[PDB]
Subunit: 36 residues, 3 copies
């Protein structure tokens, strides 16, 4: 329903933000290997 859609969108926004940070952490490790 409407309220369930609002909550689903907020949960997806937060899941994507968390994935963006996980990828930034992966990138830091990859850059340490690339420049090692």
């Amino acid at each position: 329903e409407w309220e369930a859609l609002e909550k689903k969108l907020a949960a997806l926004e937060s899941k994507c933000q968390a994935l963006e940070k996980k990828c930034q952490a992966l990138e830091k490790k990859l850059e340490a290997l690339e420049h090692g």
Copy 2:
């Protein structure tokens, strides 16, 4: 419209879930290099 928004949100949820799994696969490869 409403129905199109519902479907767009479900498609985005699935795209993000697929990206999370792709990143986990990248992380496994990176960890093999980090610990090689």
Copy 3:
């Protein structure tokens, strides 16, 4: 509100598309290390 939800969903769709491309760029670098 409704219009704010529509815009939030479009902004999230674009953020995810940008993250997918960033991960593809990370994967290219990782594959160069894996096959180096």
